[PDB]
Amino acid sequence: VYAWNRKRISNCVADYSVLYNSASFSTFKCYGVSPTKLNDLCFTNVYADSFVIRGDEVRQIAPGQTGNIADYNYKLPDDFTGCVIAWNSNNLDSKVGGNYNYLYRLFRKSNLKPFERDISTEIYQAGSTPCNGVKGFNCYFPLQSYGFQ
Amino acid sequence: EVQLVESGGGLIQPGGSLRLSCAASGLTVSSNYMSWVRQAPGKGLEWVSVIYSGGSTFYADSVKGRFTISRDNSKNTLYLQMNSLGAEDTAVYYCARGEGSPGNWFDPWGQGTLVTVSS
Amino acid sequence: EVQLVESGGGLIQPGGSLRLSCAASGLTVSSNYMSWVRQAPGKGLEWVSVIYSGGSTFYADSVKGRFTISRDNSKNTLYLQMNSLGAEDTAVYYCARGEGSPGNWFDPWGQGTLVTVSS
Amino acid sequence: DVVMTQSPGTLSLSPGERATLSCRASQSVPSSYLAWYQQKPGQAPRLLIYGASTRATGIPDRFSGSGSGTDFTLTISRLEPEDFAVYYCQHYDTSPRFGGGTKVDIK
Amino acid sequence: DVVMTQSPGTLSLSPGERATLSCRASQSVPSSYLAWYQQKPGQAPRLLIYGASTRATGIPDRFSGSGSGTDFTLTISRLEPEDFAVYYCQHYDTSPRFGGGTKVDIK
Amino acid sequence: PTYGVGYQPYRVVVLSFELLHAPATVCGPKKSTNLVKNKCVNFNFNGLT
């Protein structure tokens, strides 16, 4: 989620009907546009932002939302015009021993702007003394692992 | 030398307002998750509210619409403004750094301050 | 029987606010130039602010954006609201009538009030 | 939206014995999301264990934590009189959730 | 935008002597825009002279002021022990400007 | 004469322009070019274009 991928789609015919009837989606919410009207609309460009989060964090992906994911990993504008789709990936992103590959940003001085990606791994300074790239007391690694099982 | 010194507790009439203050030393209030957790006399611990380093604030349902968490970076002090206080709000309030989540646990804790809501 | 009695000094934490009051007798606050001048411990005199009889206010660059001068004609009292006080603001503040210009010199002076900015 | 229940309500064990406190979850909770806090009388809660197995800084080695899923255990080996306190298990699903606490009396 | 400098920093003269304090301006300042104030220890400043030559009401005649342009002088004739205080020269160009002060010690 | 520029006298003239809902009486210098004859030109005489 902190390194959410983005794909730019342009100069193509977007078949939304087949797209929305392919898989079973546990969450499908659109804002500023209906799913069925997209077949009638044209746009300069499209952006597909893909990532993985917790189930309880899925609610944070929406306009006017706040939280660790919304503030420090992936932020949407209050006037967002587009759709959000989410589906459980337990059979894909979970391991018996725990899947720690997926990470999320935990500490950050300020909240992210909409559609801003932060991949910094600098030690977060939680106190007055500088950290100088050494993690310890009041010096925390900014990322935390999910460890899905 | 990390300390959290709390103040502002005492007696408040029902329906009145109050402000609890929490001066922090050894850590930066504006750069850390700061939570308020209350414990009623003889009962367990109840998380009241939290403020993130980025400024976002969250409150427990028992206090939504009545409590407001804030901070002063210049004074490095956390603040909790309580309004429309009732009998159930009588408790000892502690300020802590963190939110009780992985890598963000409540540590350290202040000595706490008692608030009594009675006529 | 002309006097300027000052009040409101004391201890204030860094980043806090305060209000100094100056009750005047023998002269009309609303009809005179009223100036606030501060003197740091062991240092010289520094003019802080002034309010004209017509209502116009002026402030020194060291206090612009943080100090606000005002008056109450009914109480005939001058007021100075100080915000975001820092270490350099610790000083003795005096209220005086006039602006130190020809025919408008600082006369008389109040006994002053000490403001200490510390944690 | 996961409820934690602590057991037993009170515990009475002589000094030097092994004290076991259980924290059960209605749903499988990751071990990294559970922590144990200690609160002696007239004192603020102190973090004992985090991650359900990691001992907090400055905590005696006799305190240990284990378990996963729907059952977590706090073990106090070689119980001492100074261990008289209330132990709470806490976790985070959407907001901090604290357990009902467990009183540890010493015979 | 005219800077005033006072001299000397401290002055030590026996009682009955003549005390001279100088206030120099980087630019020529009108005499009417300069004033001298006295501040005894633990007391608020008191207006001594205004217009650089006019004695304030209730001030002893031994205090006098003179000078113009870039040099002004405050003279205390027949110095007395009670004259122990700090003397400041003040003027106005765009805002009140006070000097660095001059300590007058008595031997 | 020996005062600083801040204390020296300065003569100030402020020109204000009162524009009411009435026929105007003051206008700036009318820009008039040299007259041209016997050639198709874009002429303007006293606002008559």
Query: Residue E77, Cβ neighbours under 10 Å: how many?
Result: 13
Query: Six-digit token pair at C71?
Result: 């008056």
Q: 């006293």: which residue's tokens?
A: F46
- Cα separation of E98 and E94, whole Å? 13
Please report, for the domain that includes residue E55, its CATH number. 2.60.40.10
Q: What residues in A contact B54, CB-CB < 8 Å?
A: 71-72, 108-111
Total number of domains in chain E: 1
Query: Six-digit token pair at E70?
Result: 């870039």
Query: Nearest residue of D to residue B41 by CA position?
Result: D42
Asked if D30 lies within 8 A of A56 by C-beta distance, the reply is: no
Sequence-ordered list of residues with C-beta below 8 angstroms from that of D65, at least 6 positions apart, any chain: D34, D36, D48, D49, D52, D53, D54, D55, D72, D73, D74, D75
Q: 């010096």: which residue's tokens?
A: A139
Calculate the alpha carbon distances from C77 to B41, C8, C30, C52, C108 in Å.
48, 12, 9, 14, 15
Please classify residue B110 by burial: count the beta carbons closer than 10 Å to its beta carbon, then call 0-12 exposed, 13-18 middle and 19+ buried.
buried
Q: What is the DSSP letter of C64?
A: T
Q: Do C57 and C50 contact (CB within 8 A), yes or no?
A: yes
- Cα separation of E52 and E29, whole Å? 11
Q: In Å, how far is E71's CA from the nearest CA of chain F? A: 13
Q: In Å, how far is D13's CA from the nearest CA of chain B? A: 22
Query: Nearest residue of C to residue E94 by CA position?
Result: C101
Q: Do A24 and A87 contact (CB within 8 A), yes or no?
A: yes
**How many residues can be counted in chain C?**
119
Q: Do F46 and E41 contact (CB within 8 A), yes or no?
A: no
Asked if F7 lies within 8 A of E93 by C-beta distance, the reply is: yes
Asked if B56 lies within 8 A of A108 by C-beta distance, the reply is: no
- Cα separation of E106 and B99, whole Å? 66
- Cα separation of A53 and A73, whole Å? 10
Sequence-ordered list of residues with C-beta below 8 angstroms from that of A13, at least 6 positions apart, any chain: none
Q: In Å, how far is C48's CA from the nearest CA of chain E? A: 9
Task: Tell me the residue range of the domain where B47 lies.
Answer: 3-117
Q: What residues in A contact D30, CB-CB < 8 Å?
A: 147, 149
Query: Nearest residue of A to residue D29 by CA position?
Result: A149
Please report, for the domain that includes residue B91, its CATH number. 2.60.40.10
Q: Which amino acid is at D33?
A: Y
Nearest to B55 by CA among B44, B69, B45: B69
Total number of domains in chain C: 1
- Residue C94 pairs in a beta bridge with C37
Using a CB–CB cutoff of 8 Å, tell me whether B81 touches chain A.
Answer: no
Which residue among A127, A140, A144 places its CB closest to the CB of B26? A127
Q: Do you find a cis peptide bond into B108, omega within 30 degrees of 0?
A: yes
Using a CB–CB cutoff of 8 Å, tell me whether D17 touches chain A.
Answer: no
Buried (b) or exposed (e) across D44-77, using 16+ Cβ within 10 A?
Answer: bbbbbbbbbeebbeebeeebbbebbeeebbbebe
Query: Six-digit token pair at D79?
Result: 């119980």
Which residue among A106, A108, A111 places its CB closest to the CB of B104? A106
Q: In Å, how far is E62's CA from the nearest CA of chain C? A: 21
Query: Residue C98, Cβ neighbours under 10 Å: how many?
Result: 21
Q: 């999301």: which residue's tokens?
A: D33
Task: Tell me the residue range of the domain where E93 lies.
Answer: 4-106
Calculate the alpha carbon distances from A58 to A27, A110, D3 in Å.
8, 21, 20
Query: Nearest residue of E to residue C92 by CA position?
Result: E44
Chains that touch E (3 or more CB pairs under 8 A): C, F
- Contacts by residues F25-32 (CB-CB < 8 Å, ≥ 24 positions apart): none
Sequence-ordered list of residues with C-beta below 8 angstroms from that of B65, at least 6 positions apart, any chain: none
Asked if A111 lies within 8 A of B55 by C-beta distance, the reply is: yes
- Cα separation of C32 and B27, whole Å? 49
- Cα dihedral sign, A125-A129-A130-A133: negative
- Residue D71 pairs in a beta bridge with D24, D68
Q: 């730019």: which residue's tokens?
A: A8
As a three-state string, the secondary structure of chain B is: CCEEEEECCEEECCCCCEEEEEEEECCCHHHCCEEEEEECCCCCEEEEEEECCCCCEEECCCCCCCEEEEEECCCCEEEEEECCCCHHHCEEEEEEECCCECCECCCCECCCEEEEECC
Buried (b) or exposed (e) across C1-37, using 16+ Cβ within 10 A?
Answer: eeebebebbeebbbbbebebbbbbeeeebbebbbbbb
**Which residues have a C–N gap over 2.5 Å right after them in chain B?**
none
Count chain B–chain C contacts defined by CB atoms under 8 A.
Answer: 10
- Cα separation of F33 and D11, whole Å? 110
